[PDB]
Amino acid sequence: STGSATTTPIDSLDDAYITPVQIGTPAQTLNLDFDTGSSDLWVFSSETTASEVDGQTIYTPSKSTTAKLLSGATWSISYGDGSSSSGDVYTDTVSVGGLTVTGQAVESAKKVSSSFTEDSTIDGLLGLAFSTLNTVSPTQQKTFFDNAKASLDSPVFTADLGYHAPGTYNFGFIDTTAYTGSITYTAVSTKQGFWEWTSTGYAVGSGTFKSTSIDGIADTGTTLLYLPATVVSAYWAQVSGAKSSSSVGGYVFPCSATLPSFTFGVGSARIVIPGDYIDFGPISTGSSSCFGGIQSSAGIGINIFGDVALKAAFVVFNGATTPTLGFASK
Numbered sequence: 001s002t003g004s005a006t007t008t009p010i011d012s013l014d015d016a017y018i019t020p021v022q023i024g025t026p027a028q029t030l031n032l033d034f035d036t037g038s039s040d041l042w043v044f045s046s047e048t049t050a051s052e053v054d055g056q057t058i059y060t061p062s063k064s065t066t067a068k069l070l071s072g073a074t075w076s077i078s079y080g081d082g083s084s085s086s087g088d089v090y091t092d093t094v095s096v097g098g099l100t101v102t103g104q105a106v107e108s109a110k111k112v113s114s115s116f117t118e119d120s121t122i123d124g125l126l127g128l129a130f131s132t133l134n135t136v137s138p139t140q141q142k143t144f145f146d147n148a149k150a151s152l153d154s155p156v157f158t159a160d161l162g163y164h165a166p167g168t169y170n171f172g173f174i175d176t177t178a179y180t181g182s183i184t185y186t187a188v189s190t191k192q193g194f195w196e197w198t199s200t201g202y203a204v205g206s207g208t209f210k211s212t213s214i215d216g217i218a219d220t221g222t223t224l225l226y227l228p229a230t231v232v233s234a235y236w237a238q239v240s241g242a243k244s245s246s247s248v249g250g251y252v253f254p255c256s257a258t259l260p261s262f263t264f265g266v267g268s269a270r271i272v273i274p275g276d277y278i279d280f281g282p283i284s285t286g287s288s289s290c291f292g293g294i295q296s297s298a299g300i301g302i303n304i305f306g307d308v309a310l311k312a313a314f315v316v317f318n319g320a321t322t323p324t325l326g327f328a329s330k
């Protein structure tokens with residue numbers, strides 16, 4: 001089997017991308033953020049405390065004939081941005097893009113923190129890192145990818161994220177029309193539970209490529225590209241009005257600049273980020289300062305290839321028993 005689904009940015013800055021998923025029988029359709037940096041499928045539900053629910057769509061397990069309470073199990077997750085949720089667990093049928101798994105754990109939120117209440121576009125998360133990071137206790141639960149691989153025509157999914165535009169998640173096949181040249185695969189370490197890998201170096205604009213190892217994770221669930229302090233200072237030293245601003249938390253630059261490109265290495269291949277991608281947007285509507293898309297990971301402790309970098313490429317998540325990551329230009 002395969003599945004294919006359109007993914008769309010939640011806003012005009014491509015802050016994050018939602019993809020409809022159908023849970024339950026008959027299907028209730030909720031728009032989830034597919035997050036390669038975490039391993040829980042959780043949703044807003046009829047369980048959720050009501051004054052924490054805003055305009056999201058809720059899962060109502062009492063309405064689905066295939067839902068079953070997983071007795072005893074609870075969950076509690078907090079993410080890199082500070083936000084957090086917890087609750088209890090059902091198993092149900094969940095389909096994405098045509099592809100259906102029965103008995104997927106769907107984690108039902110009792111409580112969500114502020115940032116989730118405040119974002120009306122996102123009805124919960126679907127985690128696609130490795131299932132060792134799943135928060136359900138006492139027995140951790142598989143991600144939708146892990147439950148799907150038995151039936152997939154190949155044990156992969158693709159991410160094809162758009163710049164200010166819709167794109168695609170595919171499961172179980174690689175669409176040869178969606179990229180150009182050939183895919184280069186690199187090894188993944190799953191020792192910390194992420195799709196973690198080491199990039200072979202970087203170039204800024206049209207200067208030299210510097211071979212230096214950057215160990216990072218490919219994370220559809222993080223908006224920006226977070227890289228070590230000195231590589232990030234090397235990029236913005238090429239943008240004449242850029243400075244680091246403690247007030248806004250990052251490098252800003254005049255929205256009128258043309259930014260140089262940024263290249264990252266994958267084995268012997270190179271992925272080029274166009275500079276307009278790194279112009280994240282204006283720090284407020286109307287302002288003449290813009291927010292950069294490459295910022296220092298010193299404060300987070302790990303380098304993150306977020307959607308800035310991933311939407312410049314077609315990305316293969318190869319979930320074979322030794323997993324790899326594939327990059328192609330598109």
Ligand SMILES: CC(C)C[C@H](NC(=O)C[C@H](O)[C@H](CC1CCCCC1)NC(=O)CC[C@H](O)[C@H](Cc1ccccc1)NC(=O)OC(C)(C)C)C(=O)O
Pocket residue numbers: 015016033035036037038039077078079080081082083119125133134219220221222223224
């Ligand atoms: C629990 C663990 C086992 C794994 C867990 N992993 C992570 O936290 C990384 C994971 O990818 C999480 C997953 C996201 C959590 C927040 C909701 C959206 C999903 N990423 C994150 O926690 C990273 C947060 C994102 O980078 C936000 C995304 C966003 C912004 C605005 C509006 C909507 C969405 N961007 C964002 O704040 O961009 C600005 C600052 C330029 C505005 C952890 O390490 O804590």
